[PDB]
Design a protein around this motif. Structure first.
Motif, PDB file in Angstrom:
ATOM      1  N   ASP A   1      85.419  19.453  44.447  1.00 42.76           N
ATOM      2  CA  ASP A   1      86.732  19.845  43.934  1.00 42.76           C
ATOM      3  C   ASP A   1      87.354  18.677  43.170  1.00 42.76           C
ATOM      4  O   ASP A   1      87.157  17.507  43.518  1.00 42.76           O
ATOM      5  CB  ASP A   1      87.672  20.293  45.064  1.00 42.76           C
TER       6      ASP A   1
ATOM      7  N   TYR B   1      78.030  23.279  50.333  1.00 40.36           N
ATOM      8  CA  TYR B   1      79.462  23.075  50.139  1.00 40.36           C
ATOM      9  C   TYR B   1      80.139  22.686  51.443  1.00 40.36           C
ATOM     10  O   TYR B   1      80.053  23.420  52.446  1.00 40.36           O
ATOM     11  CB  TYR B   1      80.092  24.371  49.641  1.00 40.36           C
ATOM     12  N   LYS B   2      80.818  21.540  51.429  1.00 36.37           N
ATOM     13  CA  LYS B   2      81.551  21.101  52.610  1.00 36.37           C
ATOM     14  C   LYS B   2      83.049  21.118  52.350  1.00 36.37           C
ATOM     15  O   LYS B   2      83.508  20.613  51.324  1.00 36.37           O
ATOM     16  CB  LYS B   2      81.104  19.720  53.073  1.00 36.37           C
ATOM     17  N   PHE B   3      83.809  21.693  53.276  1.00 39.65           N
ATOM     18  CA  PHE B   3      85.232  21.883  53.020  1.00 39.65           C
ATOM     19  C   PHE B   3      86.133  21.862  54.264  1.00 39.65           C
ATOM     20  O   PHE B   3      85.666  22.018  55.398  1.00 39.65           O
ATOM     21  CB  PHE B   3      85.449  23.178  52.227  1.00 39.65           C
ATOM     22  N   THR B   4      87.431  21.673  54.025  1.00 37.68           N
ATOM     23  CA  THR B   4      88.436  21.731  55.086  1.00 37.68           C
ATOM     24  C   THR B   4      88.872  23.165  55.407  1.00 37.68           C
ATOM     25  O   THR B   4      88.981  24.017  54.518  1.00 37.68           O
ATOM     26  CB  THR B   4      89.688  20.889  54.747  1.00 37.68           C
ATOM     27  N   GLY B   5      89.163  23.395  56.682  1.00 38.71           N
ATOM     28  CA  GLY B   5      89.496  24.704  57.203  1.00 38.71           C
ATOM     29  C   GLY B   5      90.337  24.496  58.447  1.00 38.71           C
ATOM     30  O   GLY B   5      90.851  23.398  58.656  1.00 38.71           O
ATOM     31  N   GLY B   6      90.554  25.544  59.238  1.00 38.85           N
ATOM     32  CA  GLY B   6      91.239  25.372  60.510  1.00 38.85           C
ATOM     33  C   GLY B   6      90.333  24.632  61.478  1.00 38.85           C
ATOM     34  O   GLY B   6      89.195  24.305  61.142  1.00 38.85           O
TER      35      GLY B   6
ATOM     36  N   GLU C   1      94.188  22.425  53.897  1.00 36.79           N
ATOM     37  CA  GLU C   1      93.104  23.392  54.080  1.00 36.79           C
ATOM     38  C   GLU C   1      92.516  23.815  52.735  1.00 36.79           C
ATOM     39  O   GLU C   1      93.222  23.866  51.723  1.00 36.79           O
ATOM     40  CB  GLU C   1      93.651  24.621  54.801  1.00 36.79           C
ATOM     41  N   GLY C   2      91.221  24.113  52.722  1.00 36.67           N
ATOM     42  CA  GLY C   2      90.581  24.649  51.531  1.00 36.67           C
ATOM     43  C   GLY C   2      90.234  23.625  50.459  1.00 36.67           C
ATOM     44  O   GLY C   2      90.221  23.931  49.262  1.00 36.67           O
ATOM     45  N   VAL C   3      89.957  22.399  50.878  1.00 36.42           N
ATOM     46  CA  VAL C   3      89.532  21.384  49.936  1.00 36.42           C
ATOM     47  C   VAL C   3      88.098  21.048  50.262  1.00 36.42           C
ATOM     48  O   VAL C   3      87.761  20.844  51.429  1.00 36.42           O
ATOM     49  CB  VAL C   3      90.397  20.114  50.028  1.00 36.42           C
ATOM     50  N   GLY C   4      87.258  20.946  49.237  1.00 38.64           N
ATOM     51  CA  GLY C   4      85.848  20.755  49.483  1.00 38.64           C
ATOM     52  C   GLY C   4      85.184  19.838  48.485  1.00 38.64           C
ATOM     53  O   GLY C   4      85.746  19.542  47.425  1.00 38.64           O
ATOM     54  N   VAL C   5      83.998  19.360  48.849  1.00 39.00           N
ATOM     55  CA  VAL C   5      83.253  18.421  48.021  1.00 39.00           C
ATOM     56  C   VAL C   5      83.049  18.982  46.605  1.00 39.00           C
ATOM     57  O   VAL C   5      82.741  20.169  46.416  1.00 39.00           O
ATOM     58  CB  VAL C   5      81.894  18.078  48.659  1.00 39.00           C
TER      59      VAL C   5
ATOM     60  N   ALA D   1      94.208  15.717  53.856  1.00 36.67           N
ATOM     61  CA  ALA D   1      93.615  16.918  53.281  1.00 36.67           C
ATOM     62  C   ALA D   1      94.298  18.194  53.754  1.00 36.67           C
ATOM     63  O   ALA D   1      94.369  18.482  54.955  1.00 36.67           O
ATOM     64  CB  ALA D   1      92.111  16.967  53.589  1.00 36.67           C
TER      65      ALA D   1
ATOM     66  N   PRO E   1      87.351  28.750  59.722  1.00 36.42           N
ATOM     67  CA  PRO E   1      87.397  28.216  58.349  1.00 36.42           C
ATOM     68  C   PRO E   1      88.733  28.464  57.656  1.00 36.42           C
ATOM     69  O   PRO E   1      89.158  27.689  56.799  1.00 36.42           O
ATOM     70  CB  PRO E   1      86.290  29.006  57.636  1.00 36.42           C
TER      71      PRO E   1
ATOM     72  N   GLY F   1      96.866  28.963  55.543  1.00 39.14           N
ATOM     73  CA  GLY F   1      96.065  28.657  54.368  1.00 39.14           C
ATOM     74  C   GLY F   1      95.849  29.855  53.452  1.00 39.14           C
ATOM     75  O   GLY F   1      95.753  29.706  52.230  1.00 39.14           O
TER      76      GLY F   1
ATOM     77  N   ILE G   1      86.204  20.927  59.967  1.00 43.51           N
ATOM     78  CA  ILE G   1      85.213  20.655  58.928  1.00 43.51           C
ATOM     79  C   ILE G   1      84.128  21.736  58.840  1.00 43.51           C
ATOM     80  O   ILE G   1      83.350  21.944  59.793  1.00 43.51           O
ATOM     81  CB  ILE G   1      84.546  19.272  59.133  1.00 43.51           C
TER      82      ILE G   1
ATOM     83  N   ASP H   1      83.566  13.498  49.898  1.00 40.71           N
ATOM     84  CA  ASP H   1      83.213  13.838  51.273  1.00 40.71           C
ATOM     85  C   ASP H   1      84.419  14.317  52.079  1.00 40.71           C
ATOM     86  O   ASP H   1      85.570  14.084  51.700  1.00 40.71           O
ATOM     87  CB  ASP H   1      82.556  12.634  51.958  1.00 40.71           C
ATOM     88  N   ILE H   2      84.139  14.995  53.186  1.00 40.21           N
ATOM     89  CA  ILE H   2      85.153  15.378  54.151  1.00 40.21           C
ATOM     90  C   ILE H   2      84.780  14.727  55.471  1.00 40.21           C
ATOM     91  O   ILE H   2      83.667  14.936  55.958  1.00 40.21           O
ATOM     92  CB  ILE H   2      85.146  16.892  54.392  1.00 40.21           C
ATOM     93  N   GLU H   3      85.685  13.949  56.063  1.00 36.45           N
ATOM     94  CA  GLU H   3      85.404  13.386  57.382  1.00 36.45           C
ATOM     95  C   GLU H   3      86.538  13.548  58.385  1.00 36.45           C
ATOM     96  O   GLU H   3      87.656  13.933  58.033  1.00 36.45           O
ATOM     97  CB  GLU H   3      84.953  11.926  57.294  1.00 36.45           C
TER      98      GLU H   3
END
Ligand SMILES: [Cl-]
Ligand SMILES: [Cl-]
Ligand SMILES: [Cl-]
Ligand SMILES: [Cl-]
Ligand SMILES: [K+]
Ligand SMILES: [Mg+2]
Ligand SMILES: [Mg+2]
Ligand SMILES: [Mg+2]
Ligand SMILES: [Mg+2]
Ligand SMILES: [Mg+2]
Ligand SMILES: [Mg+2]
Ligand SMILES: [Mg+2]
Ligand SMILES: [Mg+2]
Ligand SMILES: [Mg+2]
Ligand SMILES: [Mg+2]
Ligand SMILES: [Mg+2]
Ligand SMILES: [Mg+2]
Ligand SMILES: [Mg+2]
Ligand SMILES: [Mg+2]
Ligand SMILES: [Mg+2]
Ligand SMILES: [Mg+2]
Ligand SMILES: [Mg+2]
Ligand SMILES: [Mg+2]
Ligand SMILES: [Mg+2]
Ligand SMILES: [Mg+2]
Ligand SMILES: [Mg+2]
Ligand SMILES: [Mg+2]
Ligand SMILES: [Mg+2]
Ligand SMILES: [Mg+2]
Ligand SMILES: [Mg+2]
Ligand SMILES: [Mg+2]
Ligand SMILES: [Mg+2]
Ligand SMILES: [Mg+2]
Ligand SMILES: [Mg+2]
Ligand SMILES: [Mg+2]
Ligand SMILES: [Mg+2]
Ligand SMILES: [Mg+2]
Ligand SMILES: [Mg+2]
Ligand SMILES: [Mg+2]
Ligand SMILES: [Mg+2]
Ligand SMILES: [Mg+2]
Ligand SMILES: [Mg+2]
Ligand SMILES: [Mg+2]
Ligand SMILES: [Mg+2]
Ligand SMILES: [Mg+2]
Ligand SMILES: [Mg+2]
Ligand SMILES: [Mg+2]
Ligand SMILES: [Mg+2]
Ligand SMILES: [Mg+2]
Ligand SMILES: [Mg+2]
Ligand SMILES: [Mg+2]
Ligand SMILES: [Mg+2]
Ligand SMILES: [Mg+2]
Ligand SMILES: [Mg+2]
Ligand SMILES: [Mg+2]
Ligand SMILES: [Mg+2]
Ligand SMILES: [Mg+2]
Ligand SMILES: [Mg+2]
Ligand SMILES: [Mg+2]
Ligand code: NA
Ligand code: NA
Ligand code: NA
Ligand code: NA
Ligand code: NA
Ligand code: NA
Ligand code: NA
Ligand code: NA
Ligand code: NA
Ligand code: NA
Ligand code: NA
Ligand code: NA
Ligand code: NA
Ligand code: NA
Ligand code: NA
Ligand code: NA
Ligand code: NA
Ligand code: NA
Ligand code: NA
Ligand code: NA
Lengths: 237, 83, 56
Positions: free
Chosen positions: A78, B56-61, A72-76, A70, B65, B70, B48, A44-46
Motif C-alpha cells: 500500500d 498479502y499481509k495486512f492489519t485487521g481486528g 485497520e486495512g493497511v497492508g504491504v 496503523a 480480519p 473498519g 495481523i 511490513d506489518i509487525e
RNA sequence: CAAGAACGACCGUAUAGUACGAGAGGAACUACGGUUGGUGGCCACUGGUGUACCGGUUGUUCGAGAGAGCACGUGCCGGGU
RNA sequence: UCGACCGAGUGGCUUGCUACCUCGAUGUCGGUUCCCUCCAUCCUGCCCGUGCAGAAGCGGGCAAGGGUGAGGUUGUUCGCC
RNA sequence: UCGGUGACUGCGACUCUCACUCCGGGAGGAGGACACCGAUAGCCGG
RNA sequence: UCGGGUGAGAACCCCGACGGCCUAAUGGAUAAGGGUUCCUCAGCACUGCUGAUCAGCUGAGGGUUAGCCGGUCCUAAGUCUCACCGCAACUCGACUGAGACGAAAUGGGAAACAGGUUAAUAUUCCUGUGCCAUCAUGCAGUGAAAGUUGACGCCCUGGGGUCGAUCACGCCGGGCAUUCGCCCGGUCGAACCGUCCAACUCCGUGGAAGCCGUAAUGGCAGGAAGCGGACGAACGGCGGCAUAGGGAAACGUGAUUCAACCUGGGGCCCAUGAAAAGACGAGCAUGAUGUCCGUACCGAGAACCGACACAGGUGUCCAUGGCGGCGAAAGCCAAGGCCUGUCGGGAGCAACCAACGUUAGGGAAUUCGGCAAGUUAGUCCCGUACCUUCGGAAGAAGGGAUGCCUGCUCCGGAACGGAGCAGGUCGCAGUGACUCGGAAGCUCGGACUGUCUAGUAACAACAUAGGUGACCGCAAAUCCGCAAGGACUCGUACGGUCACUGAAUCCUGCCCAGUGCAGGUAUCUGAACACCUCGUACAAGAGGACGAAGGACCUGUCAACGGCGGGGGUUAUGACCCUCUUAAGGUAGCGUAGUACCUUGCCGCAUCAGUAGCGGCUUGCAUGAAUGGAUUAACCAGAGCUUCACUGUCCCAACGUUGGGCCCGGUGAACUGUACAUUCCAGUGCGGAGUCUGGAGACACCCAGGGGGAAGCGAAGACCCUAU
RNA sequence: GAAGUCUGUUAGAGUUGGUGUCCUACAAUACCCUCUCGUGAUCUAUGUGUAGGGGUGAAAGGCCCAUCGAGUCCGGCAACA
C-alpha cells in the motif's frame, strides 16, 4: 505507618517501570517541511509490544524508514501519504482541516506537529464532526467533544486490532504475560487484606474498609485511596 | 459445542469457554483476501492477517480480519465523496 | 530453608577487596567504592567525628 | 524379724420340682463338677517365632552346565529342629 | 419403710471467701501407666429388723481381705446410653 | 452646594501584546498578564 | 580378612590375594571460591574423633611455558566520569550531552590438530602437520558499497547424519574347558586441503479443468506432475594429509537404531522473543611480525561457605557403557574410583533403647482421630453408577488373563520392534524379586493451577480470571523529589490509575436520617492585602465596607461507610395499614449454621448403644444478598462422618534381625556445685523440711537399672498487677 | 497433538504426616520414611537495580547477610528510672 503501594510506584524502580528497552518505536507523525506531501510504501506489518496492536513499517521517498501507528486495512505494498495535499484514504495523515467531516480518524494531535496524542489504542477512533477556519470539533473515544486547532494532523481510519478486549484472559497466566510488557505491578493485593500499617483500609478482625471509600480530591498521597473524588457510587439511583 | 475450548477440560466455567470457542472459531474460519478475493487469509498474530495464496499481509481486528468500525471507514469516505 | 547454616553455602561472591588507595580490604569490587577510606566516592579521605568519643 | 490375696468370686448337678405356698411359683445344710479373675512354675501336647537349616523361584553377574554373590542387613515364596 | 420444720455437728472431695507461701517460674485440663491408702460398703462373709410364707426384696449392724470389668456420643472431668 | 473636567482608588465586566508558559527543526502557532515560581492568608488535612 | 613389605614401634602406611562399597556418582571435565593445599626429600612437638612409619600436618627445596585455550575487543540490564543545573553546602541529587565501564563456566567472537615428554605443565614444551591476522614486497585487480552475516521466542514434527550401542561375518589376542563351545577385548588413524549434496528458493520446458504431495498441514491455468537446469548443508561421505602417527598382534567389511552436527514443514501470542564489535561481499605468491595478563592443585561426607577434616549448603558439561524395562525408574554389573560417610577388641551378646521381620484366633474392641502400620499395585481384555459447566466423573466400581518350552501367523524395508495362534509343560505363587493405585459414599470450605508465616500455622488465609464502582482528553488522572527534575510513558479511554467483590449458574430487595464523596446555592457565615471611619503630628490598636475556597442550607449517590428494630391494627410461607426511635424495617434465599446462648433443641436415618455425622423441622441469644446471598461439576498433603477391604492400633503379648547398651585397649569433654548430707514416719516452721523436734531405721565401699524426691537442671514469669 | 491437563523420587523445585531420630546435635533449623509440584503465574546460575520510617512484599507484619511491629555499625552516652 508505611508508604502505600501507590507511593512506591512514583520512585520509578524496576518493578514499576515499563520494559522500555524491549519496545520498538515511539509512534509519531513524520514531519513534513510545509505545504507539501510525501509518500511511502508499506514494507511490513509487525506487532507493537507496547500496545498489543499491530504496527506498519513504511519506507518513505526521501529514504527514511520508520514504524507508524496503523489503522485497520493497511497492508504491504500500500502507498501512504502524509501532508496537506494527501489523498483521503485509510492510512493517510492530513490536517483536520483537509479531512471530510464525518470521517473516522486516529492518532490525533493535541497541538499541531506533536506527533499525535488521542485515539491511539486498539480499535478506537475519533469522529471528526465540525470544520471552521478557527476550530475543529472532534469526538474522542471517551465521548468527549474536543475543540482542536484545524492544523492538528490525524490519520484516516480506525486503529487496528479492534476487538482485543472481547476475549477473556481466562487465566492468571495470560494476564501475567501481558503485564510483563507493561509499566505495571501485578498481581493486586486488596488494601483490605493488608495490615493497618500498610494501607488505610488495612487492619481489623475481618476484612472491610472501616471508613467511607469516597475520598476528597484534597487528600494527601498515602491517604488518597478507594473511590477518588467520586461524584456518585454504585449502580442504581 | 466445546469447540477449541476442549483444551481447557473442566476448568474456567461456561462463559469463558464458550466465548473462547466462538471467538477462535470465527478467527479460524476461511477469510476472503482483500487483494485476490481468495479464501486463503490466516492470522499471523494479534491484528495481523496474511494470505497464503498471494502473500498479502495486512492489519485487521485482533481476532478477525475486519471489524464493524473498519467496515464503516470505507463507507464514510464515499458518503463524503459526494457531499 | 534455614536462614542460618544452610543459607551460608551460597556465599562465593567477591565484594570487598584490597583497596589501591588505603590498603584495607574494603574496596567493594561491585560498587567500585572503598567502605574504609572512601576511594571511588571521595577525593578527600573518609573520616567521621563519631569514630572517636566526642571529647577526644 | 520381714513379705503375701495366694488366693477372690461365680455358674451348674445331686439335694428337689422337695421344704414353704390355694396356686403361681420355689429355697437351704451338705457333697460334687466346672468357669472366671489373680498367683507361681513348666514346655510332653497345641500354637507363635525360629535372617540354624532344606526346597521352589524372579532379575542380574561369574561364558553355558554345575556351583555361587547381590537384591537391607532372609530378594521373594513354601516347610521348619 | 419414707420422713417436713427446727436444733447440734463431722468431713475437707465442690464452690465461694482470704491474700499467708512462690512471680531471678513448684510445667495446664482430660486421659494413660504404676504404686500406696481412706470408709461414709456397690458385691462378697457374718448378722438384726421387716409392711419377713417361700422366692425375690427393702432397711439396718459388723467389716476395707479380695473384687468393682467391656463398649457407643463427647477433649471432656462429669454425665447420657 | 450648584455641573464640564486630571489623578488616585473600592467595585465586576471586557479587549489587547510585550514579559512569562506550551507546541513547532524553523517560519510561525496556541495561551497570556493568567498560569508557573516566590511570599502570605483561610479551609481541609492520623 | 589372610599372608607379606618397611620400621624402634604397625588393626587402620605400602604390596598380593580373597571379600566388598559407589553407577547423574564415591567416576571424568570444570565455574565461583580457596591460595600453594600441587610434586619431591626429611620429619612426628602440633593438627588428624584411636594409632601412624601415613598425611591437606611440620621443615626445606622444586613446580604453572600459548599468534590458534581463556582474558584482552564488542555491546546487555545497568554503572561511573566530565559538563550543565540544583543544594546553605558536599564525598549529595534527577535530566540532558559527551566519554568510559559493564559477560573468563553461560551472550557476540579471526585462527590447531595428532603424537611424544615430566616427580610436578602442556590444544602452551618437543616432533610432525595445519591454520588466522597484520604489515612489507611482487603479480592480479582497481571492482568497494549495496547487500548478506553476526542475529535470536514457545509447542509439534519430517529428512540428512557421525559417535556410541547392537547384529552378521572375517582376522588378531585372551578366558573357560573331566562335558558343551561358548565368553571377553581389539581390529585404529586428526585438524586441515580438495571434492560431493539433500532441504529451501528460483529458471526453462511442460500443459494438468482432478490431478500432484505429506507424519500432518497442504499445492496448482496467477501454470500441478514429469523433464532439464541455476543457487545451494553437516563437527557428514569420499580422496589427500599418511611407507605421518599408534598398536604385542590383526591393523575390518556390511547392516540397524541413530546423541552431536546439518536442513526443512506445521502450530501458538491481549506474550512478538537483544545489541554492538566483527565477518562475508573483496584474488594469489614470498617474507616479517603476533607483545601483555591467566595457566599449579582442590572443586568437596577432608582443599569452597557454614568457628571444625561439619551427615548442612554450593552452578555447568559428560542424558548414548551392558542386562533390564515405558523409562535418564528399580535391581544387578562394567569402565573408573574407593575400603577415609576413618577408633578398635570381647561376651548367643542379659535388662533397656533405635531401626526392622514374623506372629495363632479375633479384626479398630485401640485412639481426640486408623496416628503408625497394613491392604492394593505393572500390562492386556471385558465392563463401568450418581452427578456434570458435556470437558469430565473414570484407572469409577467389578470380572478375567499374565511363566516357561516347541512350532508358527499378522503389521512393517527392518530391528537384537510390535500384535496374535496352536500344542506341550512346572510351581503354593508367573507384574514370582524389584518396580508397582486400596476402593466407595455423605457433609463443610475455597471454583480451578498458583502464593504464604526462611526457623512450631500450607489452611478455609493471599492471588487469580470473571463481576463492579471511582478518577482522568494527556500542559490529564495517579505517584516520587528540598530543588534541579522524575515513574507511569517508545503509553493515550479497546488506555492508565484507584478501590471493592472473587470461576461458572440463578440472583443481587428496602434505606441518603448520621458519616463520607460530589454538585448547586437567593440568603447567612467566612481570613489576609488593598479601601473607608475613629485613634496616633506617625505607629500600635478599635471598628466598617467588600466577600474566595470552606461551612450553614438544598440536591445526587449504598457493587460508598453502614443500617434493615421496638411497640400496635387486620388465607402454607405470609399479607396490608400503622406508630415510635433513627432513614428504612429483612425481599429471594439459607437456617440449631465454621453464625444458635438455651443445647446432647425435636423428629427421622445409622449403631447393641452415636453430646458425632447426615436429612427434615426451625420463632434466627446474635442469618441474608459484590460487608455479596443461594448453589455448584472439576480440583485439594484443607475440616467432620459412614461402608467394604486391610491389618500387632487393641485383646496380649512372643520370638527373631541389625546398631547400641555391658566388659577390655586408646582418646576424652560438658551441665552442675553456700555448707553439711545413710535416711524414713510424724510434727513444727513464712502455712510445701535430708539438716528444726520426737521417734523409727541405719556396718563401709562399688556395679547395673528405671527416674519417686532434692517444690532436680535449664530461662532476673510470657499470665497478672505496679512504674507520673 | 492442544493443556498454568494427568501419572512419574528423570533432572529439578516444594515441605503434609510421623507430633519418629536428634535435641551439651552431624546441624544456632540436621537425618530417615511419608508426602506435593514437575511445559509453566515453572525451576535455576551469573550479572544488575531498589536502602532503613526507606525498600521489597500473590499480604504472613513476611523479607532486607543466624539481626525486623522499623537492619547493622559507631557516636550522642557515664541516657533517665
Ligand atoms: Cl489489562
Ligand atoms: Cl492417651
Ligand atoms: Cl582459562
Ligand atoms: Cl515435512
Ligand atoms: K509465681
Ligand atoms: Mg511521544
Ligand atoms: Mg476487565
Ligand atoms: Mg488460553
Ligand atoms: Mg514489570
Ligand atoms: Mg486481589
Ligand atoms: Mg492479615
Ligand atoms: Mg493508617
Ligand atoms: Mg470478605
Ligand atoms: Mg468485605
Ligand atoms: Mg534474617
Ligand atoms: Mg579488615
Ligand atoms: Mg542378603
Ligand atoms: Mg510382591
Ligand atoms: Mg518440679
Ligand atoms: Mg463402718
Ligand atoms: Mg486394702
Ligand atoms: Mg500518632
Ligand atoms: Mg600431597
Ligand atoms: Mg612417638
Ligand atoms: Mg613420605
Ligand atoms: Mg545501556
Ligand atoms: Mg569492556
Ligand atoms: Mg563466550
Ligand atoms: Mg596435573
Ligand atoms: Mg608466522
Ligand atoms: Mg591444570
Ligand atoms: Mg572425614
Ligand atoms: Mg544384639
Ligand atoms: Mg494376628
Ligand atoms: Mg475384617
Ligand atoms: Mg472406639
Ligand atoms: Mg476406649
Ligand atoms: Mg497413615
Ligand atoms: Mg511382512
Ligand atoms: Mg457442621
Ligand atoms: Mg484453593
Ligand atoms: Mg513456619
Ligand atoms: Mg499445603
Ligand atoms: Mg509447616
Ligand atoms: Mg481469598
Ligand atoms: Mg477484578
Ligand atoms: Mg476489573
Ligand atoms: Mg441435627
Ligand atoms: Mg440428641
Ligand atoms: Mg445490596
Ligand atoms: Mg504447720
Ligand atoms: Mg532424728
Ligand atoms: Mg522477673
Ligand atoms: Mg499482656
Ligand atoms: Mg500440570
Ligand atoms: Mg507429578
Ligand atoms: Mg530440632
Ligand atoms: Mg539476581
Ligand atoms: Mg497479625
Ligand atoms: Na480494614
Ligand atoms: Na477452699
Ligand atoms: Na523462685
Ligand atoms: Na493429666
Ligand atoms: Na473390702
Ligand atoms: Na463414655
Ligand atoms: Na583409621
Ligand atoms: Na568435507
Ligand atoms: Na538400556
Ligand atoms: Na500444577
Ligand atoms: Na445516609
Ligand atoms: Na448522605
Ligand atoms: Na447484615
Ligand atoms: Na494446591
Ligand atoms: Na510388629
Ligand atoms: Na528421680
Ligand atoms: Na519433610
Ligand atoms: Na530504621
Ligand atoms: Na551510645
Ligand atoms: Na526515667
Amino acid at each position: 505507618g508505611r508508604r502505600i503501594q501507590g507511593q512506591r510506584r512514583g520512585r520509578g524502580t524496576s518493578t514499576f517501570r515499563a520494559p522500555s528497552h524491549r519496545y520498538k518505536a515511539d509512534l509519531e507523525h513524520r514531519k513534513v517541511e510545509d505545504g507539501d506531501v510525501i509518500a511511502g510504501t508499506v514494507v511490513d506489518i509487525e506487532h507493537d509490544p507496547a500496545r498489543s496492536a499491530p504496527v506498519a513499517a513504511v519506507e518513505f521517498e526521501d529514504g527514511d524508514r520508520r514504524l507508524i501507528l496503523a489503522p485497520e486495512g493497511v497492508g504491504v505494498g500500500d502507498e501512504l501519504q502524509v501532508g496537506v495535499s494527501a489523498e483521503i484514504a485509510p492510512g493517510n495523515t492530513l490536517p483536520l482541516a483537509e479531512i471530510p467531516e464525518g470521517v473516522p480518524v486516529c492518532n490525533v494531535e493535541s497541538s499541531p506537529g506533536d506527533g499525535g496524542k488521542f485515539a491511539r489504542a486498539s480499535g478506537v477512533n475519533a469522529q471528526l464532526l465540525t470544520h471552521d477556519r478557527n476550530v475543529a470539533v472532534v469526538k474522542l473515544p471517551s465521548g468527549e467533544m474536543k475543540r482542536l486547532d484545524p492544523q492538528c494532523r490525524a490519520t484516516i481510519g480506525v486503529v487496528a486490532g479492534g476487538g482485543r478486549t472481547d476475549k477473556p484472559f481466562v487465566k492468571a497466566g495470560n494476564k501475567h504475560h501481558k503485564m510483563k510488557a507493561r509499566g505495571t505491578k501485578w498481581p493486586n493485593v486488596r488494601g483490605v487484606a493488608m495490615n493497618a500499617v500498610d494501607h488505610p483500609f488495612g487492619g481489623g478482625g475481618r476484612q472491610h474498609p472501616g471508613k467511607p471509600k469516597s475520598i476528597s480530591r484534597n487528600a494527601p498521597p498515602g491517604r488518597k485511596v478507594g473511590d477518588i473524588a467520586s461524584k456518585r457510587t454504585g449502580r442504581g439511583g | 459445542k466445546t469447540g477449541s475450548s476442549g483444551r481447557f477440560g473442566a476448568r474456567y466455567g461456561r462463559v469463558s469457554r464458550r466465548r473462547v470457542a466462538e471467538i477462535e472459531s470465527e478467527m479460524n474460519e476461511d477469510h476472503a483476501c482483500p487483494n485476490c478475493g481468495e479464501d486463503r487469509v490466516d492470522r499471523q498474530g494479534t491484528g495481523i492477517w496474511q494470505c497464503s495464496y498471494c502473500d498479502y499481509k495486512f492489519t485487521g481486528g485482533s481476532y478477525k480480519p475486519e471489524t464493524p468500525g473498519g467496515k464503516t471507514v470505507r463507507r464514510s469516505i464515499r458518503a463524503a465523496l459526494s457531499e | 530453608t534455614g536462614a542460618g547454616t544452610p543459607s551460608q553455602g551460597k556465599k562465593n561472591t567477591t565484594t570487598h577487596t584490597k583497596c589501591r588507595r588505603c590498603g584495607e580490604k574494603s574496596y567493594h569490587t561491585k560498587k567500585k567504592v572503598c567502605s574504609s577510606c572512601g576511594f571511588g566516592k571521595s577525593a578527600k579521605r573518609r573520616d567521621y567525628e563519631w569514630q572517636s568519643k566526642a571529647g577526644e
